[PDB]
């Protein structure tokens, strides 16, 4: 058991992640984790008005991860 998610093809690629409460971030993944935790370096989050705010390297847990869409062709 405890199989890690297949995130080897999405390594070092710019993807957009969706978090609970209607949150949207975009950034390049820098690693993987068996608990679905993603490290996004130089991430930019979308605000409510539509402006993008750069938050840098952030860590998103798997408990609030909704959907991750790869914006680059892998």
């Amino acid at each position: 058991k405890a199989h890690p998610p297949e995130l080897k093809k999405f390594m070092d690629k710019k993807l957009s992640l969706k978090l609970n409460g209607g949150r949207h971030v975009q950034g390049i993944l820098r690693g993987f984790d068996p608990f679905m935790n993603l490290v996004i370096d130089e991430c930019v989050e979308m605000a409510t008005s539509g402006q993008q705010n750069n938050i840098g390297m952030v860590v998103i847990r798997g408990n609030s991860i909704i959907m991750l869409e790869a914006l680059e062709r892998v």
């Binding site: 998610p5 408990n63 991860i65 869409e69 790869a70 892998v74």
Partner: protein, 83 residues
């Protein structure tokens, strides 16, 4: 250690299916990767949600935590799924 709906979802990889999330998002396309924990990774996917925002993306990945249901074709419901 592997369930029969998990085996039916793993055997249906490569067909035009859809996955409806708990928030209503329907990721439709060819199931490229289907793990044992309902992790659906699709290529050339399409987002048709309960919000209705229909778009086309190159690659999508929906985990089994927020996945509500999965709509699969009836090509694998005859054999070897007959028990």
């Amino acid at each position: 250690s592997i369930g029969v709906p998990i085996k039916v979802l793993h055997e249906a990889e490569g067909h035009i299916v859809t996955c409806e999330t708990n928030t209503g998002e329907v990721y439709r396309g060819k199931l490229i990767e289907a793990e044992d924990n309902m992790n659906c990774q699709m290529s050339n996917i399409t987002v048709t949600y309960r919000d209705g925002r229909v778009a086309q993306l190159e690659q999508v990945y929906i985990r089994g935590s927020k996945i509500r249901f999965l709509i699969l074709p009836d090509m694998l419901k005859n054999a070897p799924m007959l028990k």
